[PDB]
Amino acid sequence: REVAMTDLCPAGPIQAVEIQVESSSLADICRAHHAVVGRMQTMVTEQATQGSSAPDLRVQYLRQIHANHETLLREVQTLRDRLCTEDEASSCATAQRLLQVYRQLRHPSLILL
Amino acid sequence: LNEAMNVSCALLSSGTGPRPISCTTSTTWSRLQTQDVLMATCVLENSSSFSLDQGWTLCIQVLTSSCALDLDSACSAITYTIPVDQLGPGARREVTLPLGPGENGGLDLPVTVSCTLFYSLREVVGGQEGVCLPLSRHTVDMLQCLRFPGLAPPHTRAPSPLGPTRDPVATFLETCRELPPSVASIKVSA
Amino acid sequence: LNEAMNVSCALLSSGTGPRPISCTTSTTWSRLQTQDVLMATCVLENSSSFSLDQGWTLCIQVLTSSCALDLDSACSAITYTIPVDQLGPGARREVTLPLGPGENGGLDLPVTV
Amino acid sequence: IISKSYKALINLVQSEQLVEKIWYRVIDDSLVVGVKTTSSLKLSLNDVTLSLLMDQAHDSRFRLLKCQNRVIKLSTNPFKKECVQIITAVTSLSPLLTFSKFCCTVLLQIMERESGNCPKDRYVVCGRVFLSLEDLSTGKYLLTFPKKKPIEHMEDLFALLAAFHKSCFQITSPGYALNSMKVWLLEHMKCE
Amino acid sequence: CTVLLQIMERESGNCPKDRYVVCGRVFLSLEDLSTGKYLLTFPKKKPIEHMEDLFALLAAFHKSCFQITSPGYALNSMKVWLLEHMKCEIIKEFPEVYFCERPGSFYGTLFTWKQRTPFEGILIIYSRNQTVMFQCLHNLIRILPINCFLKNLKSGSENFLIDNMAFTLEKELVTLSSLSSAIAKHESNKVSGALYREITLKVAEVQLKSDFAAQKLSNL
Structure with missing residues (x-):
């Protein structure tokens, strides 16, 4: 579907096309994401070196994304140290x-502009 | 030997679209006994005059999910082969083989078919080993492996898959011993 | 059971069209690993009301040539057998088999299923 | 009444014992089922088969079950006189051994070939074979080789005549006659 | 036969290394075998001293791989079950391999056993068909503790898949935090869409790795 996003860009919300996938199985989503983002590396490197580049806001939402990435990075680091120490409830x-x-991060993933 | 260098020159050189010998890999869903199954139709086609005589052969190698697992998987990959015999100009052949579900829907998907050709005179006369000329390296997705039965053209009653509720080793173990939809999305420039 | 008696009785009757349950078989050249193979598609179709519950099960039997020989063959015939579940009225299963050569390239006829 | 009604059901579809007796062996990853006929059943006149059917209370799933059918005719002290006609089947084990165990029902079908009406589709459920890992944990049905050289339960011989890959041969030695066979057989191969 | 070993690189999505090797030939014929010479036919090939023999089995043999955890209890009934119930010979050369010498229907079935953290072992079963792998677990389930939790493993062990998933995400989060930090220096110098696209390629390259580790752990 089409979803125009105005606090991504400084002037024009491009009418960016969003692609969803929804399923019972988290593995099938991981696979279809893997295939599709391969397909979006293809199309983006085919178009880059020919097409132009949109400007950013630089502010507000890249920093929203920075704070919400940093909290999760700390969490994964503490988790890896606990998995190394091997205390109790081994890894469930x-x-x-x-x-x-994973679910948190995937929902918006790589707004390519 | 002559035809070998003429063919090798043709395939190595000509950084062009149209190559004289080609290997198209498609996919197809087939039905056996009851199950639905995945065929790679690997078509070799000969658009040129070079006529792959003999000493000429073909070496399909069906790579799995490609990562460095600690235990391993039973099967790293499969490696089919064939002798191509005469294959004059314009002529072609189709080779069907399985990717199809490994034991319990067991199909992690990146899965690549990589075709090669292989030339050795030691076959005709020796005297100094052989040649491997790569050809059509296609990958299979998830996005090709989906099937749409509600939308399907015929509107004909095909039975719903409902693949095995457990692994046979898993059922075995349970018996011997006695929710939200996950999402992902992308946005991209119009 | 009562639905069983009703199905049974309807089939053993010749009303002249095998209304209540039918199964069509029909032939399909496939291709495998290289070689052209013969498959027989076996459709079960429910026209009647009766829902073939649990308890019901299908056998198919694949008879070679008839005229029993001097040397007893390796494989006289094969039989495949499946449980039918909950068929329902209107509803159907298809099954395809092999009939086709692996040994000899050797397929001899009439074959009956 | 329920019981009344199956028996009603069974006479609804419809005495002479056509089949003696069911037996079975395990060969390795091969279930080998067989039976013994009587005089009554003429394999000359009737193409016959032998299916297996699994019990759904165990088998929650549609796996289709296949089996291969052989006829084995053995001549019995030729040195009226006894022929032994036995019909027998095969299929794979590790498909069934999903639930430590199952019970397979055993179904012999018969069609006539003289008659193009197929007037006579009899069947006969000739019994049922229950098996498990605890049956085999203690041998009991396997054949595992050479200790079972001295072959004295004939079931075990017929298991090997269904499960094994049969290849036939004509031998013509046309500027000689042909007696080296007995030597090879008894000597070079050491046949019992 | 000619024997051909093909080699692809994973790292590079260009397919830039298609290195092939022709690693010899194998002649075979009826007469080499009519005199044994190469064949593995059993119990005589017990005292195992041509390691090529061992490998030829590890290959032709149906493989089954199992996790075992006895959570509130250390686990060494394995070392009794192996050497006594099933009558194993340890191969000296590779002392983590067990060849079964129980003399009916288990003979020439190979195990191996890693006991890291004496609760959590990992067992790998080489069998001569699948009936044999069943008859082993059955015979082991009788001899195990009450809480000892069996589980079927297709593609690697749970500990290693969580480590692999954890690393492909920790690198990804760092590469996206690197995106935001590469923009946050551009603030001190509005953003180059070219730079944003540049970094989304590198992040896509790592997202593809987290996706793969997630289908692996979301099978498991």
């Missing part, structure tokens, strides 16, 4: 929390 809550990390 760790597994089910790292998939929550």
Whole structure:
């Protein structure tokens, strides 16, 4: 579908096309994402060196994305140190929390502008 | 030997679209017994005059999910081969083989078919080994492996897949011993 | 059981069209690893009301040539057998088999299923 | 009444014992089912088969079940006189051994070939074979080789005549006659 | 036969290394075998001293890989089950490999056992068909603790897949925080869309790795 996003760009919300995938199985989403982002590397490197580049806001939402990335990075680092120390509940809550990390991040992923 | 260098020159050189010998890989869903199954139709085509005589052969190698697992998987990959015999100008052949579900929908998908040709005179006369000329390296997606039965043209009653509720080793173990939809999305410039 | 008696009785009757349950078979050249193979598609179709519950099961039997020989063959015939579940009225299953050569390139006819 | 009704059901579809007796062996990853006929059943006149059917209470799933059918005729002290006609089947194990165990029902079908009406589609459920890992944990049905050299339960011989890959041969030695066979067989191969 | 070993690189998405090697030939014929010479036919090939023999089995053999955790209890009934119930010979050369010498229907079935953290071992079963791998677990489930939790593993162990997933995400989050930091210096010098696209390629290259580790852990 079409979703124009005005606090991404400084002037023109491009009418950027959004692609969703929704499923029971988180593995099928990981696979279809893998295939599609391969396909979006293809199209973007085919168009780059020919097409022009949109300007950014530089401010507000890149920093929203920075803070929400930094909190998750600390969380994964503390999780890796606990997995190294091997205390108790070997890796079940760790597994089910790292998939929550994944889900969090995937929903908006690489607004390519 | 002559035809070998003429062909090798043709395929190595000509950084062009149209190559004289070509290997198209498609996919197809087929049905066996009951199950639905995935065929790679690998078509070799000969657009030129060079006529792959003999000493000429073909070496498909069907790579899995490509990463450095600690235990391993049972099967790294499969490696089919064939002798191409005469294959005059304009002529062609189709080779069907499985990718199809490994034991319990067991299909992690990046999966690449890589075709080669392989030339050796030691076959005709020796005297000094052989040649591997790569050809059509296609990959299979997830996005090709989806099937749309509600939308399907015929509106004909095909039975719904409902693949095995457990692994046979898993069922075995449980018996011997006695929610939200996940999402992803992208935005991209119009 | 009562639906069983009703189905049974309807089939054993010749009303002259095998209304209540039918199964069509029909032939399809496939291709495998290289070689052209013969598949027989076996459609079960429910026209009637009766929903073939649990308890019901399908056998197919694949008879070679008839005229039993001097040397007893390797494989006289094959039989495949599946449970039918909950068929429902209108609703259907298809099954394709092999009939085709692996040994000899050797397929001899009539074959009946 | 329920019971009344199956028996009603069974006489609804419709005495002479056509089949003696069911047996089965495990060869390795091969379930080998077989039976013994009587006089009554003429394999001359009737193409016959032998299916297996699994129990759905175990088998929650549609796996189609296949089996291969052989006829084995053995001549019995030729040195009236006894022929032994036995029909038998095969398929794979590790498909069934999903639930530590199952029960396979055993179904012999018969069609006539003289008649193009197929007037006579009899069947006969000739019994049922229950098996498990605890049956085999203690051998009991396997054949595992040479200790079972002295072959004295004939089931075990017929298992090997269904499960094994049969290849036939004509031998013509046309400027000689042909007696080296007995030597090779008894000597070079050491046949019992 | 001619014997041909093909080599692709993963790292590079250009397919730039298609290195092929022709690593010899193998002649075979009926007479080499009519005299044995190469064949592996059993119990005589017990005292295992041509390691090519061992490998030829690890290859032709159906492979089954299992996680074992006895959570509230250390686990060495393995070392009794292996050497006594099934009658294993350890191969000296590779002392983490067990060849079964129980003399009916388990003979020539190979195990291996890594006991890291004496609760959590990992077992790999080489079998001569699947009936044999069943008859082993059955015979082991009788001999295990009550809480000892079996599980089927297609593609690597749970510990390593969580480590792999964790690293492909920790690098990804760093590369996206690097995106924002590369923009946040551009503020001190409005953003180059060219720079944004440049960095989304590098982040896409790492996202593809986290996706793969996630289908691996979301099978498991």
